[PDB]
Amino acid sequence: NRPILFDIVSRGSTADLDGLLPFLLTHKKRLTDEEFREPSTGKTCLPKALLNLSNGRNDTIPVLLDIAERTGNMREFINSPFRDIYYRGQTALHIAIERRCKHYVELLVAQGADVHAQARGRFFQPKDEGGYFYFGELPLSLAACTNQPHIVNYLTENPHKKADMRRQDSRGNTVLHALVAIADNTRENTKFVTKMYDLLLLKCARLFPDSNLEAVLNNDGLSPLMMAAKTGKIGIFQHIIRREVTDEDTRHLSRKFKDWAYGPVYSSLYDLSSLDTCGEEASVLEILVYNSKIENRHEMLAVEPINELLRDKWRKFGAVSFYINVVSYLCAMVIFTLTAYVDYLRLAGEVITLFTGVLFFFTNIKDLFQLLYFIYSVLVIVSAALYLAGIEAYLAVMVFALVLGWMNALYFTRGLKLTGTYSIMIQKILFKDLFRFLLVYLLFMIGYASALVSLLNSETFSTFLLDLFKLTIGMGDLEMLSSTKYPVVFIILLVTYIILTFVLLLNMLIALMGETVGQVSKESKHIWKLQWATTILDIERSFPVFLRKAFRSGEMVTVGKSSDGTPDRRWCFRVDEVNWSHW
Amino acid sequence: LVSLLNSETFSTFLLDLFKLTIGMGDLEMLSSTKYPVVFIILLVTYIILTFVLLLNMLIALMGET
Amino acid sequence: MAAIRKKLVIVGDGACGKTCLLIVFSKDQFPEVYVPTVFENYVADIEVDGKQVELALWDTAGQEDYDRLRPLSYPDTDVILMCFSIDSPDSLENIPEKWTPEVKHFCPNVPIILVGNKKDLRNDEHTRRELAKMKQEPVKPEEGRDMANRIGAFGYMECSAKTKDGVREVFEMATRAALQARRGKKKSGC
Ligand SMILES: Nc1nc2c(ncn2[C@@H]2O[C@H](COP(=O)(O)OP(=O)(O)O)[C@@H](O)[C@H]2O)c(=O)[nH]1
Numbered sequence: 001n002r003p004i005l006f007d008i009v010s011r012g013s014t015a016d017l018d019g020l021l022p023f024l025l026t027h028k029k030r031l032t033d034e035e036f037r038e039p040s041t042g043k044t045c046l047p048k049a050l051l052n053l054s055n056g057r058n059d060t061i062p063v064l065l066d067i068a069e070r071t072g073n074m075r076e077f078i079n080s081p082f083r084d085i086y087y088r089g090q091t092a093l094h095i096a097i098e099r100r101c102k103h104y105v106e107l108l109v110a111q112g113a114d115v116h117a118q119a120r121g122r123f124f125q126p127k128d129e130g131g132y133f134y135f136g137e138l139p140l141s142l143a144a145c146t147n148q149p150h151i152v153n154y155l156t157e158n159p160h161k162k163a164d165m166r167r168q169d170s171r172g173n174t175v176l177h178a179l180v181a182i183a184d185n186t187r188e189n190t191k192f193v194t195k196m197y198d199l200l201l202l203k204c205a206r207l208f209p210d211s212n213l214e215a216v217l218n219n220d221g222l223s224p225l226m227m228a229a230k231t232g233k234i235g236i237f238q239h240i241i242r243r244e245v246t247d248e249d250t251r252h253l254s255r256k257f258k259d260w261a262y263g264p265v266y267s268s269l270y271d272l273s274s275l276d277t278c279g280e281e282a283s284v285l286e287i288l289v290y291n292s293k294i295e296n297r298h299e300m301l302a303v304e305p306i307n308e309l310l311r312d313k314w315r316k317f318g319a320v321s322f323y324i325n326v327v328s329y330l331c332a333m334v335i336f337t338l339t340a341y342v343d344y345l346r347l348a349g350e351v352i353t354l355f356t357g358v359l360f361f362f363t364n365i366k367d368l369f370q371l372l373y374f375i376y377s378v379l380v381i382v383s384a385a386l387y388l389a390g391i392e393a394y395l396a397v398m399v400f401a402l403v404l405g406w407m408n409a410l411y412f413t414r415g416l417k418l419t420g421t422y423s424i425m426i427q428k429i430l431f432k433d434l435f436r437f438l439l440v441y442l443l444f445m446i447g448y449a450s451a452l453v454s455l456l457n458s459e460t461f462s463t464f465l466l467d468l469f470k471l472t473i474g475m476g477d478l479e480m481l482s483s484t485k486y487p488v489v490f491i492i493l494l495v496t497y498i499i500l501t502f503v504l505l506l507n508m509l510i511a512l513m514g515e516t517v518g519q520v521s522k523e524s525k526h527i528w529k530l531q532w533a534t535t536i537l538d539i540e541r542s543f544p545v546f547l548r549k550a551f552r553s554g555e556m557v558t559v560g561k562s563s564d565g566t567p568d569r570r571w572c573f574r575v576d577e578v579n580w581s582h583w
Numbered sequence: 584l585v586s587l588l589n590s591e592t593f594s595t596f597l598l599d600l601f602k603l604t605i606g607m608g609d610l611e612m613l614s615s616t617k618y619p620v621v622f623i624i625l626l627v628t629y630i631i632l633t634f635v636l637l638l639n640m641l642i643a644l645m646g647e648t
Numbered sequence: 649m650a651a652i653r654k655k656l657v658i659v660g661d662g663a664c665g666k667t668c669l670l671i672v673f674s675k676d677q678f679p680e681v682y683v684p685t686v687f688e689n690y691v692a693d694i695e696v697d698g699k700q701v702e703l704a705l706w707d708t709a710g711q712e713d714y715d716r717l718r719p720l721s722y723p724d725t726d727v728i729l730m731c732f733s734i735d736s737p738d739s740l741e742n743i744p745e746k747w748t749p750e751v752k753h754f755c756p757n758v759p760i761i762l763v764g765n766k767k768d769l770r771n772d773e774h775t776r777r778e779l780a781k782m783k784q785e786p787v788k789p790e791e792g793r794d795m796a797n798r799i800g801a802f803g804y805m806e807c808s809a810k811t812k813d814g815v816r817e818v819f820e821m822a823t824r825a826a827l828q829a830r831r832g833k834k835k836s837g838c
C-alpha cells in the first residue's frame with residue numbers, strides 16, 4: 001500500500017521494490033494515480049525518494065524511473081506538480097537541485113523532466129508576502145541562487161533541452177533579477193553573487209550575441225541595476241556600476257572604460273546609460289533618492305560615478321541657480337506684504353497678490369513638508385470670495401497665510417549649504433520633540449486651568465485663562481488670586497504649575513540634543529547631501545526636455561567599434577583619479 | 584500685527600512690542616485692535632517662534648558649530 | 649524570441665470531448681482504443697502573431713473523486729475553454745446554471761471561449777433519430793451564438809476531433825485571448 005511504498009522509498013532499499021512492476025501492470029495502476037499520491041499535497045513517490053539520501057546516494061531512483069518508463073507514464077511521473085498552496089508547483093527537479101545532487105539533476109534532465117516548470121506556492125514568495133525563500137521560481141534561477149555553478153552549466157549546455165536564460169516568471173523577473181533579490185550586504189554573499197552574475201552574463205552573451213540580458217525588464221519594469229538601487233543591495237549595485245571585463249568579444253557589456261594615462265594620473269570613462277536626468281527611462285539616481293526607502297541610502301551615494309555626477313551637476317545649477325528660486329519666494333513675499341496697504345497701480349498689485357498665491361497653489365498641485373506649503377495655498381483661496389462679499393473675516397485668513405509665508409523662508413534657507421543643517425534641525429525639533437511636547441502641554445494646561453477655576457469657586461474660565469497667559473508673560477496682574485475661595489492652596493499650586501510646565505519644557509531641550517539630535521548630529525553631513533540632492537533634482541525636473549538637453553553632463557564618446565561596426569556611443573562622464581601605487 | 588490692528592502707527596506698535604518682549608510694557612496695542620481674537624493667539628505664537636528658533640540656536644551651536 | 653508560458657484549462661460536462669479535443673491537439677492522432685479520463689502535464693508550442701507561446705493544458709473531469717480536487721486547478725489560470733456537446737442538448741442549459749458560477753467564483757476576470765464539439769454528429773442519422781425520440785434537435789448554431797453573447801464569451805467556435813476540423817484555429821484564438829492582459833482594474837479601492 002501507499003504507506004509501505006513511502007517507507008520503502010524512505011529507506012532506499014531497491015530490493016524491497018522487487019515485484020512492484022508486476023503489481024502495477026496487473027492492477028493497471030500508475031505511479032501518478034491519486035491513491036499513490038499523498039492527498040494533502042499531491043506528493044508522488046519520486047519527491048519522497050529525493051528528499052531522503054544516504055551520503056547523497058539513493059538506489060531507488062533508477063528503478064522508479066525504469067518502472068515509470070515501463071508503464072508509459074514517465075512524462076506525468078516526472079512533471080507531476082504539488083497542488084498545496086504552501087508548496088504549489090514544486091517538481092522533482094526543484095528537489096534535486098536543492099539537495100545538491102548533480103548526477104540526479106543530470107538524470108532527470110535526460111529523462112524529459114520539465115526544465116521551465118514554475119513553483120508559485122506561497123512558501124516560495126518573498127518575506128513581505130509571507131514566503132520564506134525567493135529564487136525566481138525557475139530551476140535555472142534556483143541553481144544560480146544556491147551557489148551551484150556546475151548545475152547551471154549543465155542546464156544551459158545539456159543536449160536534450162536547454163533552459164533559456166531570458167525566461168521570465170509570473171512576476172517577470174529573470175535570473176539576474178532573482179540574483180539581485182537574494183543578495184545581501186554581507187561580504188561573502190556579495191562575492192559569490194557577483195561571480196555568479198558575471199558568469200551568467202558572459203554565458204548569455206556567448207549564447208545570445210544580439211540580445212542583452214540586462215535590457216530585459218520584469219512586469220514592474222525594473223532592470224537589475226535599477227532594482228538593486230531601489231531595494232538597497234549595495235554590493236551588487238556597486239559591482240554592476242563598475243563592471244570591467246577583459247574579454248574582447250564581450251567588451252561592450254562592461255561599463256567603466258579607461259581612456260588614457262600619463263603616469264600617476266589616470267582618467268577612466270564611465271557609462272551614464274540609465275543613470276542620468278532628462279531621460280525618458282527611469283533614472284537610477286532619481287529612484288535612489290525618490291522612492292528608495294532604503295536604510296543604506298546614504299552609503300549608495302559614495303560610489304565613484306554617483307558622487308561626482310552631483311558635483312558636475314552642482315556647477316551647472318547648484319551653485320548658480322539656487323539664488324533665482326530663493327528670490328522668487330522673496331518677491332512673492334513682498335507682493336503679499338503689500339496686501340495690508342497711484343490707486344490704479346496699487347489695485348493692480350493687489351490683483352497680483354491673489355495671482356501670486358494662485359500661482360503658488362497651481363505649482364503646488366502640480367508637484368503633488370510641502371503639506372505646510374499646501375496649507376498656505378489652501379488659505380489663499382477663501383480671501384477672494386469674502387473680498388467679493390465684503391465680509392470682515394478675510395483678514396484672519398490672510399494673517400495665517402502671511403505668517404506661513406515668512407516661515408516658509410526657512411525652507412529656502414535649508415537649500416543653502418550654510419543653513420542646511422540648522423534649518424533641518426529646527427524642523428526636526430519642531431516635528432519630533434516640540435510637536436509632542438506642545439501636544440501634551442496643551443492638555444495639561446487646560447486641566448490645570450480647570451483646577452484653578454475650581455479653586456476660585458465658561459466666561460469665568462475665559463477670564464482666568466487669558467489672565468493666566470498674561471501671568472506666564474508676567475505683564476498681567478494677579479486678578480484671579482483676589483477672587484478665590486481658597487488661595488492658600490492655589491498659591492503653592494500656581495507656582496508649582498508654572499514649574500511643571502517650564503521644567504518639562506526645559507527637559508525637552510535636554511531630550512532634543514541627545515535623544516533626537518544624537519542621530520542627527522552623526523548623519524547630518526549625509527542628510528545634507530540628500531537634502532542637496534533632492535533640491536538639485538527638482539530644478540532639473542522643472543526644466544523642459546530642451547532645457548535639460550542643454551546641460552546633459554558628460555561628453556559623448558565612441559567607446560569602440562561594435563559588432564555591427566558603428567562604434568557604440570554611450571554618453572560617458574569622465575572621472576579623473578591619480579594613484580602612485582602600482583604602474 | 585499692524586494689519587490686525589487696522590508709519591507712526593507702526594512705530595508705536597513696534598516700540599511697545601519690544602517692551603512687551605521685555606514684559607515691562609503694557610498691552611496698549613491689543614486694546615486698539617479691530618480683530619484681537621486672531622491676534623491674541625498669534626502674538627503668543629510669534630513670541631514662541633522667535634524664542635524657540637533662538638533656543639534651537641544654542642542646541643545648534645554646541646554640536647553643529 | 650523567448651517563449652511565454654500561458655495556462656489553459658478546460659471545464660465541461662463529461663463525454664463532451666474535452667480530453668479528446670486536447671489529445672487531438674497534442675499528437676494530432678485520434679486514439680481509437682484508449683482515452684485517459686484526463687490529459688495532464690503537457691505543454692504545447694504555438695505561434696500566432698510573431699510570438700511563441702508555450703501553452704500548458706490542464707484538464708478537469710468529474711466522474712469520480714476528481715470533482716473534489718477540481719478547484720485547485722483554477723488558480724493562476726490564463727484562459728478557459730468552456731466546452732459542451734453539440735450532439736447533446738442537455739449540456740447547453742447547465743452551462744449558465746452550474747458551470748459559470750464556479751468559474752467566476754474561483755477565477756474571475758479571465759477570458760472564456762464557449763465551444764461546441766463534434767459538429768459531425770448533429771447531421772448523423774442515429775443522433776438525429778435519438779433526439780427526435782424525445783422531440784428534441786441538435787444544438788443549433790444560433791443557440792450557441794446567443795449563448796456566447798449571453799454569458800460574455802470571448803469567442804464561439806466548433807470542433808471535430810474525429811476529422812480534426814477547426815482545432816488549430818480554436819486554440820489559436822484561445823492563446824490570442826490569453827495574451828491580452830485584461831483591462832487594469834475596475835472600481836479599485838483607494
Ligand atoms: N465519432 C466521434 N466521437 C467522438 C469525437 N470526439 C469525441 N468522441 C467520443 O466522445 C467520447 C468521450 O469523450 P471524452 O474525450 O472522454 O470527453 P471528456 O469526458 O469531457 O473528457 C469518446 O469515447 C469518443 O468516442 C468525434 O469527433 N467523433
Ligand SMILES: [Mg+2]
Binds near residue numbers: 666684686
Ligand atoms: Mg476525460
